[PDB]
Amino acid sequence: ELPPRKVCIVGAGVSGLYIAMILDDLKIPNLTYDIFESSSRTGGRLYTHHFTDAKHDYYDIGAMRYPDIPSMKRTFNLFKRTGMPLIKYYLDGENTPQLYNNHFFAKGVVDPYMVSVANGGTVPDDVVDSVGEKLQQAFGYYKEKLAEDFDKGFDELMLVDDMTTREYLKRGGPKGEAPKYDFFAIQWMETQNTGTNLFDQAFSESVIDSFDFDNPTKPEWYCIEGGTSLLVDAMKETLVHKVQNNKRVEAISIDLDAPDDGNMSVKIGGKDYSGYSTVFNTTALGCLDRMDLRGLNLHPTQADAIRCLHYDNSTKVALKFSYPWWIKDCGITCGGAASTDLPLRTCVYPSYNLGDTGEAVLLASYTWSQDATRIGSLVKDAPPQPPKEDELVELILQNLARLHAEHMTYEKIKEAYTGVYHAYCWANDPNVGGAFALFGPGQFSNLYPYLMRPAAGGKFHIVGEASSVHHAWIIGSLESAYTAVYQFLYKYKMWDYLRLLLERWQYGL
Amino acid sequence: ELPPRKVCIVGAGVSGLYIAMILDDLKIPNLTYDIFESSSRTGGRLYTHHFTDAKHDYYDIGAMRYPDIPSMKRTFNLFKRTGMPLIKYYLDGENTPQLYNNHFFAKGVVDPYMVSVANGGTVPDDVVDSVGEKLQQAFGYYKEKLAEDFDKGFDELMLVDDMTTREYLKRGGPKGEAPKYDFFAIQWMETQNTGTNLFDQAFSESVIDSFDFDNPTKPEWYCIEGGTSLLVDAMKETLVHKVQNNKRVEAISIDLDAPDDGNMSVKIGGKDYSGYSTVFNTTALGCLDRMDLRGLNLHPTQADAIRCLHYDNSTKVALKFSYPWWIKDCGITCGGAASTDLPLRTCVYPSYNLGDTGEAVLLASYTWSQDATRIGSLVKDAPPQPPKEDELVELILQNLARLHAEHMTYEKIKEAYTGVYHAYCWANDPNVGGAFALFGPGQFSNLYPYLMRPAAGGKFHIVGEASSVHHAWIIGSLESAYTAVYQFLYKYKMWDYLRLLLERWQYGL
Ligand SMILES: Cc1cc2nc3c(=O)[nH]c(=O)nc-3n(C[C@H](O)[C@H](O)[C@H](O)COP(=O)(O)OP(=O)(O)OC[C@H]3O[C@@H](n4cnc5c(N)ncnc54)[C@H](O)[C@@H]3O)c2cc1C
Numbered sequence A, B: 001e002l003p004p005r006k007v008c009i010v011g012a013g014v015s016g017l018y019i020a021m022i023l024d025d026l027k028i029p030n031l032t033y034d035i036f037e038s039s040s041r042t043g044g045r046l047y048t049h050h051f052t053d054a055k056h057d058y059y060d061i062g063a064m065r066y067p068d069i070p071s072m073k074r075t076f077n078l079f080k081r082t083g084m085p086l087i088k089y090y091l092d093g094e095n096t097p098q099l100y101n102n103h104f105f106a107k108g109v110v111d112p113y114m115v116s117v118a119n120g121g122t123v124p125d126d127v128v129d130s131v132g133e134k135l136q137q138a139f140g141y142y143k144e145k146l147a148e149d150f151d152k153g154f155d156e157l158m159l160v161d162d163m164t165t166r167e168y169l170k171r172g173g174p175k176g177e178a179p180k181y182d183f184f185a186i187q188w189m190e191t192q193n194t195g196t197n198l199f200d201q202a203f204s205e206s207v208i209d210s211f212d213f214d215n216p217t218k219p220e221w222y223c224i225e226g227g228t229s230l231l232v233d234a235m236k237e238t239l240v241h242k243v244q245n246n247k248r249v250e251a252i253s254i255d256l257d258a259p260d261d262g263n264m265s266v267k268i269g270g271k272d273y274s275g276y277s278t279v280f281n282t283t284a285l286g287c288l289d290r291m292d293l294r295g296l297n298l299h300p301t302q303a304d305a306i307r308c309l310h311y312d313n314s315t316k317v318a319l320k321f322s323y324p325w326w327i328k329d330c331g332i333t334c335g336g337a338a339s340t341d342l343p344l345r346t347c348v349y350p351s352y353n354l355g356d357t358g359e360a361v362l363l364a365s366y367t368w369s370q371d372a373t374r375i376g377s378l379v380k381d382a383p384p385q386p387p388k389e390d391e392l393v394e395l396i397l398q399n400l401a402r403l404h405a406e407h408m409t410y411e412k413i414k415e416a417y418t419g420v421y422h423a424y425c426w427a428n429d430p431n432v433g434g435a436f437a438l439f440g441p442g443q444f445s446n447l448y449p450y451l452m453r454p455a456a457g458g459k460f461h462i463v464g465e466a467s468s469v470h471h472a473w474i475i476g477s478l479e480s481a482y483t484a485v486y487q488f489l490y491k492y493k494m495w496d497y498l499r500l501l502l503e504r505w506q507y508g509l
């Protein structure tokens, strides 16, 4: 029979909970685990903010929307296994405004935003109306390969991973045989396609982003009615060993001079927790880098990956209104999102309140990168009280009025605002230190393989979305967790249970 | 005689104060100004934190150190004009530790850090010990041109501005005739030379950074004894019209239908302030982007520059100790700085406390870019109180013990720590939204010229360090301010006073 063994799961986000879910399902004799979570809260970047207990009065600060595409099958299987109430999420709605250079988009008009050279701007005339087509030409080949087989497509994409998106567009691809674009053409493509400055990160990441958001299969999207935190609730409920919150791991070690399976330990608040046969670290890499890892003897390049792999920032701001004025007054009855060059950048109309006539939540601002850092500078842990003006609220109200100026006035939007809002900047969260991995040029092809290198003789695993090829998605966390469990069972040669893992979990259970 | 005119200065940092200082010196008949500052505090990124009123018990959160090089002459002239108490600043000290891959640097040893291929790492053997030489070969030609004439050198540098530092090193320069470096070679150069990920920004910015920090003239450095805020005090004192604090400009406009000189206005807290013949905006670009600028009719590309020009992040953490253990125990008696791959990254030993035997301040962490964002995630407006652990303090104490392990133990460093510290993350400051401009590839050569474009018929100026070719220095703010004043006098044809400006201010007064 199997000897008694214990493993340590660092962090209680979806990766850590999924590891525990797999172990609980396999029911390996005499195997137990501790799950330590630094926060008082469980679920990590799955985080629903409830303004009240009212059915729809919430927004998702973390994960919100799921495209139903083959590479995401494991995520949807988790949704099914846990009985999640899925409803349609509308990525594109009806009547959503798009506002750039203070002009609204109009179909069938040349340069509606008046940013082209012909109109006194610097965007090349042959670019301004063509961003979709030109980026399709840039990304399209690789998206098609990714759609056939994600892993094979990814390996082929790695052959160009040395370039930033800007570099690829500037030079016409790796041999110069694709179209070459000037600075202002690329700037406009970035402005239309993504967050400020993000074309200065990996071309491969832009490709994958486009694969996920504009997938060749033209997928249905879903969200969880009641918020994504319902998944965390469901996952917690089934745990054989409950999450231990307020436990922040500060060091991880292995004693190589000890013959035992159980020769690993972690330190929490100066105290040693020992006897572990494997440690799965599930935290964002910023949190991992702060730990004292000397006791693991990590490869220097693996250590570099932990410090240097790039993370994007993201900020969300949600406001409550006495009625859904966007639905009633503006005819935006189907969800979707408005985009603009104004500071808010993106206004997302909830897909879960469409029938409500009373109080309603609007995700008024959703930003990334430098845009998110700038909104984030206004987001305080203790928002300013009414004896003072809230600069962030006034900014959002003013931007919303401009974006909605076709049907709304600032006065009306402000009058409908209830005075209740919430905002969150992920780079300001001490338990994450960023929104999610978005790698720089060369990182996937050079550093990532060392991040994923076996460590501590095969007993230490760096697990999570960053530790996968699908960054910024639940799927990345789940695939990473599944793969680490595979490696743990293999290491200890538990062949019955590895066979069972494959039988039950290969597509997810 | 000159008609009555009024101008508006937005923001009370060094740029805005300098504009007012110039106007006050010229004494133009019937000319007045308002200076509006959003903060309750004056001086912006000149900010000294005093722990107590004790002579040396402070650190500079903003500007701290000044190299005495020709391109900085205007800064030193300001120091002289205001009677600043300058003392030597030691960029390099004695006995400062350097720690990477958990090894201390040793002179005359091959790969002391054990990161080269020969030692089981990935840094090429021909790179690891040669970073200085290889970066000198990369930057050297341009540094020499900048040293001859900064403006001419800058114009020549613009011819390669399309490249990131990484790209320049990867491709062997613009025609491929310089050495070409692989990913891990570039990674190590970045690790040794700058903040995490910064080689993914403009090659030109890396050049200028190297020009400023390792200048061919091998300059003396200075700091202001008593802190940089003494300069703000001195500048405020002389103002003919005092700073109006707690006034946050939310919009700027010109009425083109009005024949008057005085046809510009700003909005503060919903209220109009009008009658201005020119407006000098001195704020960081993030703050400018949040204003409603429609009333200025800015060129679309000028608007893009405001949104898109890249800013770096920077974080500082200063701790007080009961005695200067670095001086007494470690022999670091001369200032300087320690560098490491640990989260703190840089530990700066003050140049102003060298003779003190009592309580003393250490700037324990000084970081940029992603390193600064990560430390910054632990920096709270209301730091956690002792009923709770302060994660940031424990991190700094642990890193300091590792960096100082040659002479110190964690226990001793912790015992000497008084429990008093202060930290600041500039990207979290709502009145800045970043530390300072650090442009991405192509930005200086493409967007910057539109940022600097005449606006509102020559009556609106975007002024500040970002609005110059020396980012991240007081000199950039002063040159920008001087140039905007020149343009204002020219616009209104005040030839006597323009001639006087040149006579008195061309090198600074
Ligand atoms: C703004 C935003 C929007 C997103 N939108 C979507 C979406 O629409 N769809 C989608 O599929 N995905 C989305 N995601 C991604 C998804 O939320 C994440 O990929 C996933 O939740 C990450 O889970 P994880 O377990 O890998 O990491 P985490 O959620 O970060 O879990 C790690 C846990 O470790 C804990 N921890 C940190 N340090 C320590 C320590 N020292 N000791 C112990 N514990 C520690 C943390 O508190 C945390 O709970 C979004 C992410 C963000 C940031």
Ligand SMILES: Cc1cc2nc3c(=O)[nH]c(=O)nc-3n(C[C@H](O)[C@H](O)[C@H](O)COP(=O)(O)OP(=O)(O)OC[C@H]3O[C@@H](n4cnc5c(N)ncnc54)[C@H](O)[C@@H]3O)c2cc1C
Pocket: B010, B011, B012, B013, B014, B015, B016, B036, B037, B038, B039, B042, B043, B044, B045, B046, B061, B062, B063, B064, B065, B066, B247, B248, B249, B250, B282, B283, B284, B287, B288, B314, B315, B426, B431, B432, B434, B435, B436, B463, B464, B465, B466, B471, B472, B473, B474, B475, B476, B477
């Ligand atoms: C971490 C750090 C270290 C540095 N170290 C050095 C150094 O060693 N040596 C050196 O020479 N330089 C250094 N600098 C640079 C120097 O501090 C800055 O370049 C300079 O102080 C910027 O001055 P400014 O007037 O251009 O901008 P700011 O200092 O940002 O002044 C702008 C002012 O506008 C105000 N404002 C913002 N929005 C509004 C609004 N809407 N309405 C009204 N007012 C508004 C702000 O509150 C601020 O006071 C450092 C900078 C940083 C961030």
